[PDB]
Design a protein around this ligand. Structure first.
Ligand SMILES: Nc1ncnc2c1ncn2[C@@H]1O[C@H](COP(=O)(O)OP(=O)(O)OP(=O)(O)O)[C@@H](O)[C@H]1O
Ligand SMILES: COc1ccc2c(c1)CN(Cc1ccc(C(=O)O)cc1)CCS2
Lengths: 389, 337
């Protein structure tokens, strides 16, 4: 149809096939996988004692179906019309249902290549959004690409990375070419978050969820990259200068993330944030995107921290602590306290949702007589006539 | 009954026979033993590297039969072994081998580069099954001979110290047999006949192997201690983690019926994180070993609550009430299953 769209075939004969697909096949997939998600996520572990576990070939077919649906949805939301929501929801539910561990351990090379190519295509589309959004705001291909991104790529990637982080599939999936593609995706997400442009503040949020999900999912501490040698799962510690030369790398540990500053730099930024007293409207990107990334990073990297690992504490890639957590959360509630009176929005609620994992993580001894300020402010501000929360 | 000879191994049975002979002699000589004049236990020497006149023909037959039994057991495991390439003989090349390690029997040793072959955990599992099965076959043969288990070797009374299940076997002997058989499997892989073997998926096992008369035991307080008014509390420490229920029961609760399957008991089950009364509903969390569950009942307001390690357990909704509506009746007593 795309080959002969402008040709003699303006009316494609296969209306029956197209209608049957878009009206039955997609919603059936969505509902079936929503109902039987536990069957496909089953493994050697037995969550569902009654039902059996999906076969390895079964999970291979699930991954193949997800990859094929992604290939279909690439750059064709406008041609799908109003069904694009249906296709993206099917991709969402399939992404939850995937079992990357078993797929990588015993999977078809075609399926593995399809997954790698899907991730590489996501990275390439993000780079195309880079190159056109930069000096493309004056000016269609650019409009189609940006619509495709903002509609599908952010939800798809966010859902997939949330699943990967929740099931710790990153150590089994994100490696070699997959890992360099994820590096490109991370650089792209950070550049979109940091950059200022009308198309950016029109979709700041979805970038926020996608980037936070990626931060949770990625198996390398990109923030505290100085402790690179300790991590065993990094390309810089596994597959060496020969493959630096073979496939292109930034070739420097600190240059792998040129636009991404260091963890201590972001910590200092958030400390003098709300203390320098700058306006929300000047640079809204930190409390909307960066703090979610910090929270996801700490939530993922706590258990690898030195205070959680007294054994070989010198052999840890990350150096987070409960004092880091309480300082960052203190900066969070200082920001909300200084910004609740003016510039009201749902972004405070979204930030609180994003920070829910860290307040769950923190020990209740601090909750005593440290979050007492939190509850007293949250009640005195809610003491208004209309009640909430 | 199911055993058949695999269809491409007829003409190769001989070559496999002398191949197993080669593995047997090389394994015997590189287990640390060496050719000697006379057989002694303290000498740790193997004088049997001599002409076939004295060499046990029964031992030769045992070697051949255990080789064929080994291959029959791999085919029984589902290993539809495949012929890959003849090029194994071309690829195998003689490394540097010392004069002492060189066999004086006259045959040329063929120690191959066994390091680079990566043993996939599936073949490790079949190796475990091969060890178990070979040990079982040996035990069966000894029992047919009349051997019986003992603390130490007694030839007069035919008491064997090693006659125990392989799972409980001593480390040294199981390690020795295990390395011998991994060497055998690795030599088969070196000749290149690849193991097209199935994978043993995890199978659910009910694990209930107690007396058929009882799948559970119920402990309760006396009927006369039933409380009908007030706020009462007790504790239940779980030394293990598994099928256990704790709660409050009517005086008429049956002992042979599971707690919470009827109207006579209100229970909490931490194995599946559920609450039980006339049915099953999700509630609370799952305990672990050493966890203490505190059960509270309030007969004034007709409510029940459960706490795990101090923290109050709550159902899908935000309520902390495991059970909120019940008639006082004849009272409640602490109970567990
Ligand atoms: N006919 C045989 N010839 C050589 N080795 C055997 C024979 N039968 C079994 N084996 C294996 O050899 C190991 C011990 O070597 P050895 O032959 O000295 O013992 P054995 O004479 O077979 O006595 P046992 O049957 O008690 O092991 C045993 O683990 C056994 O599995
Ligand atoms: C008892 O004369 C024999 C007869 C046959 C063989 C051996 C010794 C040498 N063996 C080593 C061996 C010996 C004894 C034990 C044991 O039972 O402790 C285990 C392994 C390999 C099998 S060929």
């Amino acid at each position: 149809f795309d080959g002969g769209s402008r040709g003699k075939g303006e009316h494609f004969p296969y209306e029956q096939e197209i209608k049957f697909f878009a009206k039955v096949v997609l919603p059936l997939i969505d509902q079936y996988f929503k109902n039987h998600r536990l069957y496909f996520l089953s493994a050697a572990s037995r969550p569902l004692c009654s039902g059996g576990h999906a076969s390895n070939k079964e999970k291979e077919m699930v991954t193949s179906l997800f990859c094929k649906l992604g290939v279909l949805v690439r750059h064709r939301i406008s041609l799908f019309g109003n069904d694009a929501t249906s296709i993206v929801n099917c991709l969402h539910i399939l992404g939850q249902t995937l079992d990357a561990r078993t797929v990588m351990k015993t999977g078809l090379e075609s399926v593995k290549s399809a997954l790698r190519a899907f991730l590489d295509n996501a990275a390439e589309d993000l780079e195309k959004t880079m190159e056109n959004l930069k000096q493309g705001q004056f000016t269609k291909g650019v409009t189609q690409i940006i619509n495709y991104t903002t509609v599908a790529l952010l939800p798809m990637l966010s859902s997939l990375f949330e699943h990967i982080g929740q099931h710790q599939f990153g150590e089994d999936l994100i490696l070699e070419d997959v890992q360099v593609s994820c590096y490109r995706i991370l650089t792209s997400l950070y550049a979109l978050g940091t950059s200022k442009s009308i198309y950016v503040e029109r979709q700041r949020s979805a970038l926020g969820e996608c980037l936070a999900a990626f931060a949770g999912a990625f198996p390398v501490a990109f923030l505290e990259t100085h402790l690179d040698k300790h991590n065993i799962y990094s390309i810089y510690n596994t597959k060496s200068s020969r493959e630096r030369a073979a496939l292109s790398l930034p070739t420097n540990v600190e240059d792998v993330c040129p636009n991404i500053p260091s963890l201590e730099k972001l910590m200092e930024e958030i400390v003098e944030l709300a203390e320098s007293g700058i306006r929300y409207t000047q640079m809204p990107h930190v409390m909307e995107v960066i703090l979610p990334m910090l929270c996801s990073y700490m939530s993922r990297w706590w258990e690898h921290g030195p205070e959680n690992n007294p054994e070989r504490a010198e052999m840890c890639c990350t150096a987070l602590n409960s004092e880091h957590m309480n300082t960052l959360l203190g900066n969070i509630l200082k920001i909300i306290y200084n910004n609740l009176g003016i510039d009201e929005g749902a972004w405070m609620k979204r930030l609180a949702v994003f920070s829910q994992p860290i307040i769950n993580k923190v020990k209740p001894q601090l909750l005593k007589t440290h979050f007492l300020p939190l509850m007293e402010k949250l009640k005195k501000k809610a003491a208004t006539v209309v009640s909430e929360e | 009954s199911q055993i058949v000879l695999p269809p491409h191994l007829e003409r190769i049975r001989e070559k496999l026979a002398e191949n197993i002979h080669e593995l047997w002699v090389m394994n015997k000589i590189e287990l640390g033993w060496q050719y000697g004049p006379v057989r002694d236990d303290n000498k740790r020497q193997h004088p049997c590297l001599v002409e076939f006149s004295k060499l046990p023909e029964q031992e030769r037959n045992y070697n051949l039969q255990m080789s064929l039994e080994t291959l029959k057991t791999l085919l029984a495991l589902g290993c539809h072994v495949g012929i890959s390439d003849e090029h194994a003989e071309d690829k195998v090349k003689k490394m540097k081998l010392p004069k002492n390690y060189q066999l004086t029997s006259g045959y040329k040793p063929a120690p191959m580069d066994l390091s680079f072959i990566k043993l996939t955990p599936s073949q490790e599992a079949m190796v475990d099954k091969l060890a178990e099965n070979a040990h079982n076959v040996w035990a069966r043969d000894r029992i047919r001979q009349g051997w019986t288990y003992g603390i130490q070797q007694d030839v007069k009374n035919r008491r064997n110290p090693r006659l125990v299940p392989y799972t409980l076997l001593d480390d040294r002997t199981k390690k020795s047999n295990k390395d011998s058989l991994r060497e055998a499997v690795r030599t088969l892989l070196g000749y290149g006949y690849n193991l097209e073997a199935p994978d043993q998926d995890h199978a659910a096992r009910a694990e209930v192997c107690s007396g058929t008369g009882e799948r559970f035991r119920i402990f309760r307080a006396e009927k006369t201690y039933a409380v009908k008014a007030g706020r009462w509390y007790f504790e239940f420490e779980t030394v293990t983690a598994g099928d256990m229920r704790v709660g409050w029961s009517r005086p008429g609760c049956q002992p042979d019926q599971e707690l919470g399957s009827d109207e006579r008991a209100f229970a909490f089950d931490g194995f599946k994180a559920q609450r039980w009364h006339q049915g099953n509903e999700h509630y609370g969390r799952s305990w672990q070993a050493g966890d203490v569950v505190g059960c509270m009942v309030d007969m004034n307001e007709h409510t029940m609550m459960f706490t795990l390690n101090g923290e109050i357990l709550l159902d899908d909704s935000g309520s902390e009430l495991a059970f909120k509506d019940f008639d006082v009746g004849d009272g409640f007593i602490p109970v567990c299953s």
